[PDB]
Design a binder for this molecule. Structure first.
Ligand SMILES: CCCCCCCCO[C@@H]1O[C@H](CO)[C@@H](O)[C@H](O)[C@H]1O
Ligand SMILES: CCCCCCCCO[C@@H]1O[C@H](CO)[C@@H](O)[C@H](O)[C@H]1O
Ligand SMILES: CCCCCCCCO[C@@H]1O[C@H](CO)[C@@H](O)[C@H](O)[C@H]1O
Ligand SMILES: CCCCCCCCO[C@@H]1O[C@H](CO)[C@@H](O)[C@H](O)[C@H]1O
Ligand SMILES: CCCCCCCCO[C@@H]1O[C@H](CO)[C@@H](O)[C@H](O)[C@H]1O
Ligand SMILES: CCCCCCCCO[C@@H]1O[C@H](CO)[C@@H](O)[C@H](O)[C@H]1O
Ligand SMILES: CCCCCCCCO[C@@H]1O[C@H](CO)[C@@H](O)[C@H](O)[C@H]1O
Ligand SMILES: CCCCCCCCO[C@@H]1O[C@H](CO)[C@@H](O)[C@H](O)[C@H]1O
Ligand SMILES: CCCCCCCCO[C@@H]1O[C@H](CO)[C@@H](O)[C@H](O)[C@H]1O
Ligand SMILES: CCCCCCCCO[C@@H]1O[C@H](CO)[C@@H](O)[C@H](O)[C@H]1O
Ligand code: MET
Ligand code: MET
Ligand code: NA
Ligand code: NA
Ligand code: NA
Ligand code: NA
Lengths: 509, 509
């Protein structure tokens, strides 16, 4: 089995797993929609009670499985719980990352397409004060790129450029993955992460210089870091905060587990896990938090910025920020730097989300790395046509896999590891080889607090939020639901085939 | 490997493979739309130049492959042509029958649902002369069953009864298939075919007694068997005739090949093949041709009958015929007999179209028959939800697989067998063990005439018919296209996995 070559490489790869579009696109919107500073208390609390403990659990499960030649959850769940149902539950650890890959790589490709166009100056040009005369050209720019519907049909019409750029993006992902763990992902991480940090810091500095009749970037920071204890009672904010924690730390995606499966059996995971998690949070709250929101508030004031944030998930990052930059000298190049940053952030995350499928094909079906990477790319590429052409298909996948799925799977993996496998055995497995030990208190958090926190969260979520979605959606949501259910059935069949190959193999040995 | 137990069983199973919904539903509509007697000249000619020769070729390929433990085209094509491209072309021999199964079993389930409702007298009751006051209740009956759209959305809403009946239908197919070739399909064929023949003969007799102010059943027969040489020039009629020949004989579906793979290496296929083909044609032109058309013409006259035939593919069989029967004493029970006949016709054909997937899983992935049958049923059942809920999805699948696909695959299999593998080797393989020899003239038909006939047909088809369809369709056709393209990719992946299992297997032996 492959192993990470160096401790630094392991850390930067894991940090690259985490630090993604979620830090720079998702976090600012989530925080802005939820009162800014009012979002941060629940967010910090979720990091401590969910983010940290689950991170350690996934590193431990991955390392544990890797020692026996397994990196994905169908096998790993079965090692922890010798029951047919463990294998079936384990399928979600292949299904979630596959579905997420299907829309995440597409969005990643947009950032590359925008970077290219901004670099070469093929961008819109607003009419030099109206907040709409400047924004409209950038809205139309995004709409033409991805092909937003102009009529009644729920169909998207992406530009030829966007389509070719997606192909290029897939090629770049494959070029890294095909080289494997140490020579591919690890080597790229050592180049991408420092680049990512430098670009982000530069952008923060530039944004911090923004001042208009409507305010300064300082006003944006104050909105984000001023608590509102009257929101600590709103369940919606807690759900948002926990959802962001999962998404941001790559928890429940099967991605941390698979990376950790390449950590040597004896190697520390306590300090490494904590370090990766902490690096992500710094990139999120300090870097991601200090770019988009302050820029928007500086130019539009808080009320308008919040309204922009609620407007859509991509409005702030693909329309508003570049429009704001365009009002400044060298703003087109600043736009390039922003999208280049997003691309490297996306890329280091997308190689992580496709590795579980690759590991399963290698580990369980005994495919060569070459074949495993290429077939994985093929399935993602083919499937992405749904997200490229059917309006709101992206939203549907992001809901079932990237939102509900990850939280559900997080609770599942914790129950299996800390309840079925054995709390004391799990505790011992986590700490084994630790450069530091996990604080004793976290034993009771993991065993009692985290599961109960998530269980209540999911129930409240399910009672007062989900029914609206099932009842109040356009019929086309069923196209995406049908397809991703088929994907689950497909992966279940592959797990079945893996069992049969193993049985026939043992009969020969 | 399993083998057919008796020669009679083999013949009735193969006859059951062929004699299906195509004889009793498809043939009458095709003949009626194309001038009746004007359809029959091209039809007879296609039977001689295409139907017969291709039947022998498929029996031969199946028997040839079966002798080496292979029953499906990915392997068999490779045996005949040691080239990676042979395996890929061979995938169509799994893809076509899978796609056809996905809509064919659903339609088959309707005939069971109708049989049940007609048996128990839960049927509509027209107002005792208006040709519309009688037909409307039966149209509404079908529309409520399958759930035809009442608004603008291209969505179907099948009754709960129709859904449960589809489940039952799948169960019945599985119950036969799970028992295998000799104890399952062969044993059922010996019961179903005689029953089928008796029901059909009875129905023909009953229809032959129909006489109204508008005409007699005799008028229907005259319309069907009166030549119109002025149509021998119309290409459309030839395309229709050849398409019906393929569909009716189960040619290009991979189904005849797979059944023949269970024929012993030395056993005759010349007389057996010819006998199965001839039995089908008798059931089609004598039985199928003498039920629906004469009944409709008797009650409505020719012009109206033809108009009904053009109305839809299911209007004649599910609406018009039962409505006509309802005007006669014991007509509800006659309706039951009709739908019972259709069901047995459908059932013996659907077990044939699912056996290729079963054989591939058994032969190439080494699954047990139990697992192979159940996974096949699961894929068909899941996929059928597309045909059940998306308006016109059925039409799209029937076009790509059941119409274009089978003719394309027929030309492919002939080219591979008679051109690449070797005309003389193919000729020798067909005749080997023959109780009779194939007439010498058919060597030149197979090698030169059949391929050229099909090639010209396909080109003319492609030039003057296909473009309208690609350009003039609702956007929802892409949902079905996307899905069945995914099915092809899925099956291609399975063939790839089969190669890898074989390679690893040989390395051990
Ligand atoms: C691998 C699955 C392929 C299914 C059909 C995909 C057809 C893609 O079609 C392409 O889409 C682009 C984006 O709209 C257009 O710019 C191109 O003109 C068009 O050829
Ligand atoms: C960075 C590598 C990808 C480049 C893909 C370019 C695809 C060509 O895109 C074409 O560009 C033309 C000129 O701008 C436009 O007028 C056309 O509408 C567009 O189809
Ligand atoms: C479920 C996803 C299916 C995607 C099917 C894509 C089929 C592409 O089809 C092509 O797309 C082009 C761009 O939209 C259009 O300009 C063409 O008219 C159309 O033929
Ligand atoms: C919500 C969970 C927050 C946990 C924060 C734990 C901070 C560390 O807490 C410390 O842990 C050490 C090791 O067990 C102990 O020796 C110390 O007494 C204790 O203060
Ligand atoms: C492609 C086949 C789609 C057929 C299924 C569509 C059935 C219509 O069901 C629709 O489902 C939506 C989502 O749950 C709901 O919001 C709507 O209220 C409901 O009418
Ligand atoms: C195996 C794939 C399942 C996908 C969702 C299928 C849901 C079927 O839904 C069922 O459809 C029937 C027919 O309209 C209705 O009569 C039933 O009330 C309904 O529960
Ligand atoms: C033959 C075995 C399948 C029988 C399935 C019956 C499913 C029940 O079907 C129900 O029947 C009721 C009474 O007719 C109707 O009023 C309901 O609308 C219908 O849902
Ligand atoms: C591509 C095929 C997807 C099929 C999805 C079926 C989802 C079933 O969904 C259910 O269907 C019932 C009958 O239509 C409706 O009455 C319900 O409102 C709907 O929720
Ligand atoms: C379009 C193809 C129609 C073929 C019909 C062939 C009918 C049989 O034709 C016969 O075949 C025998 C065996 O070769 C010969 O000995 C006879 O002389 C010949 O008449
Ligand atoms: C589910 C995703 C569907 C997106 C693809 C729809 C693109 C619209 O393309 C449509 O295709 C039809 C069939 O070729 C043609 O008849 C129409 O002229 C064309 O507009
Ligand atoms: C695509 S890996 C999961 C998401 C990633 N952690 C991000 O924040 O973007
Ligand atoms: C479903 S097997 C192919 C069709 C069959 N020969 C029929 O006529 O119905
Ligand atoms: Na992150
Ligand atoms: Na990343
Ligand atoms: Na037939
Ligand atoms: Na049949």
């Amino acid at each position: 089995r492959e192993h990470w070559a160096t401790r630094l490489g392991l850390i930067l790869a894991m940090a690259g797993n985490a630090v993604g579009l979620g830090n720079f696109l998702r976090f600012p919107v989530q925080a802005a929609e939820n009162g800014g500073g009012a979002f941060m208390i629940p967010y910090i609390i979720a990091f401590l009670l969910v983010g940290i403990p689950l991170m350690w659990i996934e590193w431990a499960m991955g390392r544990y499985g890797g020692a026996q030649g397994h990196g994905t959850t169908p096998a790993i769940f079965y090692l922890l719980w010798r029951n047919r149902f463990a294998k079936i539950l384990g399928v979600f650890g292949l299904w979630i990352p596959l579905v997420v890959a299907i829309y995440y790589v597409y969005i990643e490709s947009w950032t590359l397409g925008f970077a290219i166009k901004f670099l070469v100056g093929l961008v819109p040009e607003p009419p030099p004060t109206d907040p709409d005369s400047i924004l409209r050209p950038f809205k139309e720019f995004l709409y033409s790129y991805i092909g937003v519907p102009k009529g009644d049909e729920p169909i998207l019409k992406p530009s030829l450029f966007a389509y070719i750029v997606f192909l290029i993006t897939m090629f770049i992902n494959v070029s890294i993955l095909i080289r494997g763990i140490s020579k591919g992902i690890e080597r790229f991480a050592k180049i991408a992460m420092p680049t990512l940090f430098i670009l982000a810091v530069f952008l923060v500095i530039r944004v911090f210089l923004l001042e208009t009749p409507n305010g300064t970037a300082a006003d944006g920071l104050n909105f984000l870091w001023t608590p509102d204890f009257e929101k600590l009672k709103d369940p919606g904010v807690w759900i948002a905060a926990v959802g962001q924690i999962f998404f941001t730390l790559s928890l429940g995606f099967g991605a941390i587990i698979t990376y950790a499966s390449y950590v040597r059996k004896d190697q520390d995971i306590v300090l490494s896990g904590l370090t990766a998690a902490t690096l992500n949070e710094k990139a999120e709250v300090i870097l991601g938090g200090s770019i988009s929101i302050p820029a928007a508030v500086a130019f539009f004031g808080v009320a308008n910025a919040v309204a922009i944030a609620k407007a859509g998930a991509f409005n702030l990052g693909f329309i508003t920020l570049p429009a704001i930059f365009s009002q400044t000298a060298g703003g087109t190049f600043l736009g390039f730097l922003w999208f280049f940053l997003l691309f490297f952030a996306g890329l280091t995350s997308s190689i992580a989300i496709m590795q579980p499928m690759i590991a399963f094909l290698e580990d369980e079906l005994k495919l060569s790395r070459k074949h495993a990477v290429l077939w994985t790319a093929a399935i993602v590429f083919f499937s992405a046509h749904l997200v490229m052409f059917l309006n709101k298909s992206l939203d549907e996948m992001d809901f079932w896999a990237g939102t509900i799925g990850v939280v559900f799977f997080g609770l599942t993996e914790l129950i299996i590891f800390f309840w079925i496998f054995g709390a004391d055995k799990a505790w011992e497995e986590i700490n084994r080889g630790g450069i530091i030990k996990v604080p004793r208190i976290y034993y009771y958090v993991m065993r009692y607090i985290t599961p109960a926190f998530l269980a209540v969260l999911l129930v409240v979520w399910a009672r007062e939020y989900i029914p609206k979605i099932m009842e109040e959606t356009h019929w086309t949501v069923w196209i995406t639901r049908f397809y991703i259910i088929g994907l689950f059935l497909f992966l279940t069949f592959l797990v079945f085939l893996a069992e049969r190959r193993r049985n026939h193999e043992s009969a020969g040995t």
